[model samples]
Target: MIKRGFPAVLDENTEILILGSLPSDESIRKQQYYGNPGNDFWRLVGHAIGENLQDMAYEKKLKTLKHNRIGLWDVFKAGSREGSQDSKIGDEEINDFSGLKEMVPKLRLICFNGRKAGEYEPLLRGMGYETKVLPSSSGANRRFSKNRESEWEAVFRHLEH
Candidate 1:
């Protein structure tokens, strides 16, 4: 059954919105964002804010995001695809983003995790929201370099309060 993936986190204080295309199989199984052990989403975000992810509880980690005024959600509500890979995603049914229009008007920046996210930018723009695409946080995107730590630091540093 196609299901809407619940956002990993959100709050009225959210100033930045981080979007992904959809939850991977591992995320769906764990009912959380970036649940795959190999994914660097959490680690990257943690390090961006100078937190030790290995020592933090899940709730504490989420709190760190909230404290930083960051919100998280996926672009796809539900869809059918050949497999968990974004390249295979097809016949997608987009989720209602109008809710965002009313909820987080102060959201100053939107960051997409990878190419799939960049692909969906036009769609989000069609809904009247513009966003900037960031380099992928997926471990699979490691080809860029081994110094992702510095890259993410730069990205987060650019966020205006």
Candidate 2:
């Protein structure tokens, strides 16, 4: 089935933007990023910033990230996917990233959540944004879980302690 992704959760104050391949069925249904309980996205992010994010209400969690200058977005604005599997995606439509400069003048980093999202790496690098590719936090990809939280150390280091 054809699936559409959420618009970026960002603002002019954004400094670091994390891009996902696409939201899973659970996320789409909840109209929230990382809605799947099994996904470690929230946990990893929480650990990075020293917050118990998963326990908070969805909107609050988003507000926290926004307040911290962290942004969220996806590579495939629209695609075909069954359930939440990234492997099932096809016929992707790229999000118009041109506005990023005007929209996020403070933006400095473009972090790809997984290899699937890294497909856009060369393009973003051409635009001169520093990039970081992280392991997927999806429970579906168990092998990447062991050290997932530690991967965000650089991100945490940049944040004002």
Candidate 3:
């Protein structure tokens, strides 16, 4: 199916921007980021921020992240996918970040949710933005042991805030 994605949840005060590859069917249906109950995004983000975000209200979750200088976005604005798997995505068109500097002038980092998403890290770094590649919170990845938390923390930890 040809699917669309949610808009970025960011603002001028954003310092750490988290980018996912695309929205899952659940997220699209729910009109919320990481709306899939099986997705580990909320759990991991909550873990990083030292709060319980998985069960928190969606609006509250966004408020908390924004309050902490965190922003949420996706790599592809639109794409064709079978369901929710990244492997099914095709005809990818990237989001326009030409105005990111002006939109989130405080943006100090770009953190990709998974390797597939992280593929753009080099481009972002070449543009002089520090980037981090994090383990995907899609629940499709489960070979986790030492990477996820540290990678996630790297985005938020040691921030001047």
* The candidate that achieves the highest lDDT relative to the unseen native structure: 2
Candidate 3 — what's its lDDT? 0.76
In terms of lDDT, the poorest run of 10 residues in model 2 is: 142-151
lDDT per model vs. reference: 0.69, 0.78, 0.76
Better of 1 and 3 by TM-score: 3
Predicted structure 3, TM vs. truth: 0.87
Backbone N/Cα/C clashes per model: 0, 0, 0
lDDT by residue for model 1 over 23-106, one digit each (tens)? Answer: 676667778754666667777776677666546766777787877777887777775544465646565766566677676776
- The predicted structure with the larger lDDT, 1 or 2, is 2
Model 2 stretches with alpha carbons more than 4 Å out:
83-87, 142-144
Predicted candidate 3 versus true structure: per-residue lDDT over 1-161, tens digit per residue:
66677788986799888888877777898888756776677766777677777778999888888887889988887877774556566867889776677777788888888776798787777656788888777767844544646666655655543
Error of 2 at 39 (Å): 2.3
Give the residue spans of candidate 1 off by over 4 A: 1-4, 83-87, 126-130, 158-161
TM per prediction: 0.81, 0.90, 0.87
